[PDB]
Each structure stands twice: as C-alpha cells, then as structure tokens.
Amino acid sequence: EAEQLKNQIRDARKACADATLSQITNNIDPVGRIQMRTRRTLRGHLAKIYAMHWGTDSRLLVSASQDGKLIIWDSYTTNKVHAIPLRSSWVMTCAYAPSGNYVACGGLDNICSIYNLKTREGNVRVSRELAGHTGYLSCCRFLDDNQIVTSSGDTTCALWDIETGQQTTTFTGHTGDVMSLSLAPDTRLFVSGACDASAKLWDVREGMCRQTFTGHESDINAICFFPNGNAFATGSDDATCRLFDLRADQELMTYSHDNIICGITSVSFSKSGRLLLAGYDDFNCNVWDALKADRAGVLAGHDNRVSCLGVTDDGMAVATGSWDSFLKIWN
Amino acid sequence: TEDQRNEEKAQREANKKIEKQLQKDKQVYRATHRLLLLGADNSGKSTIVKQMRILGTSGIFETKFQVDKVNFHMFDVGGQRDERRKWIQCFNDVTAIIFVVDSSDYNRLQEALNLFKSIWNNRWLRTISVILFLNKQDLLAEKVLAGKSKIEDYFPEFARYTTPEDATPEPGEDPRVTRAKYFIRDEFLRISTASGDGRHYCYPHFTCAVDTENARRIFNDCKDIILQMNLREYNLV
Amino acid sequence: TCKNWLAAEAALEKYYLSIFYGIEFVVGVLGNTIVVYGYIFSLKNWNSSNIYLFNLSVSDLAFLCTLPMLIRSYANGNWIYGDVLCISNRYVLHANLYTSILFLTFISIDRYLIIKYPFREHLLQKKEFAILISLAIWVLVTLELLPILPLINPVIGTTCNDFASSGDPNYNLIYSMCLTLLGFLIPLFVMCFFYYKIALFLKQRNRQVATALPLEKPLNLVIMAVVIFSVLFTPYHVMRNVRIASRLGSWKQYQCTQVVINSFYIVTRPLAFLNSVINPVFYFLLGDHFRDMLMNQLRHNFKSL
Amino acid sequence: KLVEQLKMEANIDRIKVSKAAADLMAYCEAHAKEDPLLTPVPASENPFR
C-alpha cells in the first residue's frame, strides 16, 4: 500500500528534476577563500557548551552549558548581562525570544524552562515550566512571546502556549528522536530533522506535516532554513550536508569532502544565503559556497568539537560554541 | 560626557559580579563528582538511588549523596526512551558510569552484557570507567540454591567454567553459587577487557537488596578512578 | 705516571667539561623551552603539582643559561668576563642546582599526596600553598648559598676558579659538607621516603583492587625517579667533599694523589648537571597527556603561522 | 497510519528543480552586498571594530 505511494513520490520528484544545481552553477564565479577572524572570545562557561542563540538585536546572545548555566552575553563588549542557574544541569538547547524578553532552555529534564529577563523584580526567574514531552528536549524556538516550538527526543515536536502553559499542537510522524528544528522567516511553518535520516516540514497552524525529505544516510544533528524560506539545509552524522528545497521537494545539493569522516553538529546560513557554515566533530567549522559547495574557508580554533553555531540576524558575525566552552565569535 | 559611560560602568559592574559568582560556582562544580546510573528497569537501580537519597522531578532523577566531605551527583536517566545513542553524548564528562545489572534474571542478562558492550565501546564513553553493580545477589543465591537455575543453557560456556583462584567468597555461601556469581562477573569483565587501551576500567561489585556500603563502594571506585586520572595528568600514567 | 695523571686532568678540564657542558646546554635549553612553552601557552588548569613542575623547569632553564661562560672559559682556559660576572654566574648556577633538587623533593611530596588524597583535600595541594612553598624554596636556597660568596670571591687577572678549588680548604669543606647535608642528603632522604610510601601504596592498591590494574609503569617511574636522582648527584656531592678535603692541610701532600682526586672530581661535575637535561624528558615528555598537549599546541602554532 | 498522511503529502504543487535552483541564485545575488560575511564590511561601521 505504502510502497505505491513512495514510488509515486519518487517518480514525481524525478520528473520535476531536470538539471542539478551543480550543473547550472558553473556560470557563477566562486566566493574565494574567506579569512574569518575571531573578534571576541566569550569564555566564562564552566563546562562544555551545548547550544546558543542570538537576539533579534544581533547584540545579545544566550548560551547554554552542561554546568547548569545559561549566560546572556553582550557580544560587543563581552560583558555577561545575566547568568541564569538552571534547575537541571543537563541543558541541551536554548532559545532567545524574538522580542528579547524571554529565554527558553530544554535538556534531559524533558521540560522547557522559560525565563523572563525584562522583569520588574530585576532578577530573572522561571516564568514558565512547560512539561508534556516524554523524552529529552533537543530544540526550542520562539515564535513570539506567547508561542514556542519544542522538538524532543520522543520523536515529536510541540507548539506550546506560554500564557496557558500546555501544549497547543503536537507534530508527530518522526520515527526517531527529533534533534533540531528551524523556524521559517515568516514563522508559518518549520522543518525538524530527526535521527531517522529524514527532515519533515510542518505547518504550525495546521499542526500536520506537509512534506518529508529523506536524502540522508544517518541522524540529522542540525538543520537551518535558507534566508528566503524556500529551502533549508541539514547536517548529519555521515559528515554530509544536504540542501533541500521546499518546492522542488528533493535535495538540491550535497556538501561533503573526502577528508571529513565526522558528523555535523550545527549548520547556519549567512544573511544573503550564499554561505553555509557547518560545525563538525573534527573540532572545526567549515564555510561552504551554498551554490557551488566549495570550502570557502575554515573556522578552526576550538580545542573541542563545535556544538552550536549561529549567524546574527543582521549577518555581521558568526558565533560558534564548542565543548571547550569558549564560544568564539568570528567575522 | 555621561550618557554612555554610566551604562558602560553598570554593565562592567554586572559582568564582574557575574564573574565572581561563576568563580564561586566553579569550585563546587569541580569538587562535585558526576555519575551516571544505567541499568535495566528490572534491576535495582531505583532502590540504590533511594538508598543514597536517604544519605529530579521529570526525565532525569538527580541524586545528591555525600560521603567523606565529597559530594557525588548521580543521574538516573530512567525517564528517557529505550534508545540512548543520542543523549549519551551529554555524559562524556561524567567521572564514572554506574551500571546496575540484575544478576538474577538470566533471560534478561545477555542483553545487559550487550548494553554494557555498546557502552564500553561507545565513541563518547571510551574514556569513562564503569562501576558495575551485579545487583540482586540474594535473589540469585536463593534461586541457584533452589534449583531450576539452568544458566548453562543460556551460556553453554558455563559448563566449561571453574571458579577463579583469586576469588574471595564469603565463608558461608554455597560453592555452586560462588561459581555462578563469579561466572556472570567474568562475562562483563571479558567485554571490558576485550576493548579499551587502559583508559577506562570496570569495577564489578556484588550487592544485595539492602546495603549501606553501595555509597562507600562508589566512593572507593571514584577515588581509584580519579587516581588513575591524576597519575595520567602527573605523567606517571 | 704522575705527569701522566697531570696531563690527564689538564686535558679532561680543557675538553671534556667544555664538550659535555655544550651537549647539556643544547639539549636542556631546548627541552625546558618546550616545557615552559607548554606550561605558559597551554594547560590553563594549573594546580600545586603543575606549579612545582613549572618551577623545576624554570630553575633548570636558569641553570643551563649560566653554562656558556663556563663552557667558553674551560675551552679557552682563561676566564675573561671580569670578577663580578664570575661570582654572579657561579652562585646562581649552584643556587639553581639546589633549587632543582628541592623541587624534585617537593614533586615527590605532591605525587605522594595526590596518590593518598586523590580528591585534593589535604590543604597542602592548594595552589596558594604551592606558590608559597615555591617562594620559600627559592629564598631558602638563596640564603643557603650566601656563605659561598666569600669562597668564590677571587683574589687578584681574574683568579676565579671552581667552587671546590677556591677559598680556605678548611672553610670550603666545613660548608661543602653542610651544603651537602642540607642540600642533597636531606632532600634525598625525604624524597626516598615519600617515593617508598608511594611504592607501598601502589602495591597495596594493586593487591586490594584486582580489577586488572597492575600499575607496573607508575611503580617503575617512582623507582627510576629517585634512582637517577641519587645516581647522578651522589657521585658529584660525595666526590666534591673529597676534592675539597684533598686540599686540607691536615694531611695534604701526595701531589700525584691530589691530581687523581681533581680529575675524578672534574669528571663528576657534568654528571650532576645531567639532571637539568633529563628532568624535562623524564617528568614531562616521557609521559602522555603533556606530550599530547605539546603536540596539539605545536599543531595550533603551525596553523597560526 | 502512513497511507492517509502520504495521500495528502502527494497533493503538493511541485515545481522544476531548475526553477528552484535559479530562484536560489536570484536571491543569493539579490542580497550579495547586504551580507557582511560574504563581502567583509570596513572596520569604520563594523560594530565589532
């Protein structure tokens, strides 16, 4: 029954495929070597950093480490504006609210803690404690001050509602753990990558999957969304990055090298979307020409594996947090 | 000459206060020893966790127990799904993995030797010692003593097995039991010895349903586990 | 044969000391430089043991830095850097030697403490206490060697010769024995005792914990750590006092025997100076971890440059 | 089950892969100068310098 539908989908994808992006990208000159330099080193985490996020203002950034600390850095001055102590030391994700008032963090507690920063008391406290996931919570992303999408290790995602404090919709269909997700620029749909080597696109409003992409061979540790929202990129344990498009329904590009045999940990795009910066278990991050799949630089400089990466919304800098816990900012 | 300078001074004051707090917390973090409590549900992991609880709400059940002026932080991860290859990466910095395995139920044992094999050879745990608790020995002793303990069928090699010379059995236990309980211990040790370049070790311990010495055993092993770490750091290796 | 021994001693002092001091100066500066590079630009998590090891490496480097004047003077046979420089260089050489010995002793006392208090809870393993003890070692050795100054102070060109052949033989000994007691014997006895305790502790731990952990390598290293220290220093210290005693007027005489004594002491000096070259290898590079840190930090430098 | 989800997944207005690749090209080259990482901005107005 399902094999017929799978065959139909594959045949439709092949019919829609005429020429690969590599084939038609020969007419564009390459970006060339990029000598990105460390402009800041935001040391201060006691243990390995596992996630970080930029504020919409592109100045503040929240970073979570396994020592139970969630530090909000002012990237320009390197000062720490808050150091939230978590109730559970094993935090695996963090998120900065688009308005900059709240900060979410998940982890092995299976619970998403939402802290309020702009609080009249002057001290940050757990504004909300969203529970309902039956597994470790592996990604958080705010849609506004009253919504947050959390993807957990129980093979599900969930759109919550902070004001009322319980699930508003549940996104199911993944076979394995849902490692990471990325919201579209319009926050009308989002793609989540799981360990079943498949990334699924969900409509936040409809609460149902729209299309799945299964071009990977192993777990999908990282996933982003091309700046225009019409395509996304994923990184898997097989050391390969894959750029899929929503409309083409299929993989557009594969970024890989013969000298990398270690999985991805974090991917992101530049403001224009021309560059794809991917963090690797090889203690370094690589910049890829999103249109030509060429290693246009390498951001080495971490004594341990890069666990999180993120470009500022204005595109000025690229923060990179690694298990060495120094969180270098590149530009 | 005051609009931007008061804010800068306030930001620096907050930064220095936060840095002082982080320095204060660093001593506690370095002093506390983090542990991971793995083992099947049929094993007595929860009972041991409570037994040191006397001396987490959802997902991961932390446990503060303190012995000899040093505090141990155990993390029973029983709230997660059956599969663990992903969140195991979180505990790459744990001092020692505590592995509680039910020595009584044999049918559910050859899987505990295989959860141990994957753990021992795991990519992110090839530098973490495993404190192995062969729990529920009283049940095993009364089960073998009462017969119907056809452990030979599950492991045919048990027929061609004899108690090792270096064993230290209690004076008043059935010699058959001593050969049965040391047989299981060796199987886990064979898995541990078959891999690892002397970078992490296995500490097999026999525990009953109730034993106040479990915290002491973990303290002794953690003492020896960091002793090896200190020797490596001091270039004695 | 008496003239034969005279020629032997002359040639020995002329060539053997210069060549050996050149080898020890080229190996040691390199090794101690690697050590200090790895300690300053890497391994941020400093502690008591790291403080002692870094202090030992710094003392050894300062010990080597004071050789070149001796090398050139023994090669050419005439010291030509004045009187002040000779006194300063020789005093700092001897002071750094004995500070190295004391830091070896305290490295043994911190290898015993960490083996006996793995959790770093005895309050002597605190970094502040280590810094205080290091400063105490430096100042104590500086004070110990002050009575050397009247001995090495030459009398007029520059009549600045070695420590054993200068000054009043009767005062050059009363002190050379005291500096051996407080300088090499006492640190040797405490180091032997504490490494003996470590060997017993490792043996007991092996017998107690039988989880396939013989720990044969650490036992050999502590045995070798004191064996090389005792075998490289004892010939020099024990022979030194004999050389000074050979200048004592109580029996004195026997010119030919004095030549033999001088030559046998002259050969023993570069042996004691060998510790300053072996220590970087034995304590830092022979083991893992630090060597891996040096290699990784040596790869980082290549990428940067 | 999976059949119901796949039935509505198939009803998607797919487009040619070449058109999608050309649209990504158009977006990339329509914001080339607006990317501080693709074209390093001068230190004069760079916030980090």
Looking at residue A77, which CATH number applies to its domain? Answer: 2.130.10.10
Tokens of D44: 């004069």
CA distance A106 to chain B (A): 11
**C11: closest CA among C269, C272, C262, C274?**
C262
Cα(A310)–Cα(C118) distance, integer angstroms: 40
- Residue C178 contacts B where some CB pair is shorter than 8 Å: no
Residues A51, A92: contact at Cβ < 8 Å? yes
For residues A301 and C303, give the distance between their C-alpha atoms in angstroms, rounded to a whole number.
9
Helix and strand totals (H; E) in chain D: 2, 0
The contacts of residue B144 (CB under 8 Å, 6+ apart) are B151, B174, B176, B177, B180
Closest-CA residue to A71 (of B22, C263, C174, C233): B22
| CA dist., res. A188 & res. A246, Å (int) | 13
* B236 contacts in chain C (CB < 8 Å): 111, 217-218, 221-222, 287
Torsion angle of alpha carbons C91, C97, C98, C104, nearest 10°?
Answer: 160
B228 and C213 in contact by Cβ < 8 A?
yes
Euclidean distance between CA atoms A75 and A54, whole angstroms: 9
Query: Which residue of chain B is at minimal alpha-carbon distance from A45?
Result: B22
| CA distance to partner chain A, nearest, from residue B175 (Å) | 44
Q: Of the candidates B166, B227, B228, which has its C-beta nearest C210's C-beta?
A: B166
- Rounded to whole angstroms, the Cα distance separating C259 from C252 reads 12
What is the CB neighbour count within 10 angstroms for residue D37? 26
CA angle, residues A92, A95, A101, in degrees to nearest 5: 140
Contact A80 B79 (CB under 8 A): no
CA nearest to A177 within chain B: B86
Biggest distance spanned by C-alpha atoms of chain C:
70
Terminal-residue alpha carbon distance, chain C: 61
* B7 and chain A in contact, CB less than 8 A: no
> Please, do chains B and C touch (3+ CB pairs < 8 Å)?
yes
Report the C-alpha gap between B100 and B38 in whole angstroms: 6
Can you read off the two tokens belonging to residue C267?
């050969």
Interchain CB distance below 8 Å, A24 and D22 = yes
Tokens standing for A286?
Answer: 């690589």
Chains with 3+ CB–CB pairs under 8 A to B are: A, C
CA dihedral sign, ordered B75, B79, B83, B89: negative
Asked whether the CA dihedral C236, C242, C244, C246 is positive or negative, the reply is negative
Would an 8 Å CB–CB cutoff place C287 in contact with chain B?
yes
**Which residue out of A29, A58, A269, A316 would a mutagenesis test of the D interface target, given it has the greatest number of D Cβ atoms within 10 Å?**
A316
In chain C, what residues touch B202 (CB-CB under 8 Å)?
211
Q: Look at B59 and A111 and tell me if their CB atoms are within 8 Å.
A: yes
Kind of pairing, strands B129-135 and B96-102?
parallel
Name the B residues in 146-175 with CB < 8 Å from any A CB.
none
User: Closest residue of A to B74, CA-based?
Assistant: A89
Distance of alpha carbon A49 from alpha carbon A265, whole angstroms: 12
Q: Measured between CB atoms, does B71 come within 8 Å of chain A?
A: no
Contact list in C for residue B232 (CB cut-off 8 A) is 287-289
Which one of B15, B80, B81 has the shortest CB-CB distance to A80?
Answer: B15
Closest by Cβ to A31, choosing from D8, D24, D38: D38
Quickly tell me which residue has 């400093």 as its tokens.
Answer: C46
Residues 6+ apart with CB under 8 A from A198: A174, A175, A212, A213, A214, A216, A220
CA distance B16 to chain A (A): 8
Contact A116, A143 (CB under 8 A): no
CA distance A85 to chain B (A): 10
Lookup: tokens for C22: 């050149």
**Quick check: do B and D touch, 3+ CB pairs under 8 A?**
no
Q: Which two tokens stand for residue D47?
A: 């916030």
Binary contact (A9, D48; C-beta < 8 A): no
Length of chain D: 49
Q: Are the beta carbons of D38 and A6 separated by less than 8 Å?
A: no
Q: State the Cα–Cα distance between residues A91 and A107, nearest whole angstrom.
A: 4
- In B, minimum Cα distance to C280 occurs at B235
B194 interfaces chain C, CB cutoff of 8 Å: no
Complete edge-to-edge strand list for the sheet that includes strand A295-298: A264-269, A275-280, A285-289, A295-298
Tokens representing residue C281 in the block: 């290898």
CB atoms B80 and A83 under 8 Å: no
For the record, the structure tokens of C163 come out as: 């420590």
Residue B18 near chain A (CB below 8 Å): yes
CA atoms within 13 A on the CB side of C52: 22
Split into its structural domains, chain A has a count of: 1
Give how far D27 is from chain A: nearest CA, Å: 7
Residue of C nearest to B235 (CA): C287
Cβ contact A274–D32 (<8 Å): yes
CA-nearest residue to A106 within chain B is B59
Interchain proximity A331–D23, CB inside 8 Å? no
Looking at the complex, does the CB of residue C211 fall below 8 Å from at least one CB of chain B? yes
Strands B70-76 and B96-102: unpaired
- Rounded Cα distance between A277 and A311, Å, is 9
Residue A196: exposed, middle, or buried by beta-carbon count in 10 A (0-12, 13-18, 19+)? buried
Report d(CA C277, CA C25) in Å as an integer. 8
Whether B66 has its CB under 8 Å from any CB of chain C: the answer is no
A183 with A149: CB under 8 angstroms? yes
Task: Check CB contact under 8 Å for B227 and C210.
Answer: no
Test A331 with D36 for CB contact under 8 angstroms: yes
Contact (CB<8Å) C210/B226: no
**Pair B154, B69: CB distance under 8 Å:** no
Angle between helices C67-76 and C17-40 (to 10 degrees): 160
Report the C-alpha gap between B141 and B177 in whole angstroms.
6
Nearest by CB: B236 against C211, C212, C221: C221
Exposure string for C241-255, b = 16+ CB within 10 A, e = fewer: bbbbbbbeeeeeeee
The residue segments making up the domain with residue A222 are 1-330
Asked if A273 lies within 8 A of D31 by C-beta distance, the reply is yes
Contact yes or no for A274/A288 (Cβ under 8 A)? no
Enumerate residues 48 to 107 of chain C having a beta carbon within 8 A of any beta carbon in chain B: 49
Asked if the Cβ–Cβ distance from A81 to B21 is below 8 Å, we say no
Whether residue B236 and residue C284 make contact (CB cut-off 8 A), yes or no, is: no
- Pairs across A and B, CB distance < 8 A: 93
Minimal Cβ distance to A231: which of D3, D12, D24? D24
Do A and B touch (≥3 CB pairs < 8 Å)?
yes
Q: B69 CB near a chain C CB, below 8 Å?
A: yes
* Structural domains of chain D in order of their starting residue, each with its CATH number: 1-49 (4.10.260.10)
Three-state helix/strand/coil letters over A131-197: ECCCCCEEEEEEEECCEEEEEECCCEEEECCCCCCCCCEEEECCCCCEEEEEECCCCCEEEEEECCC
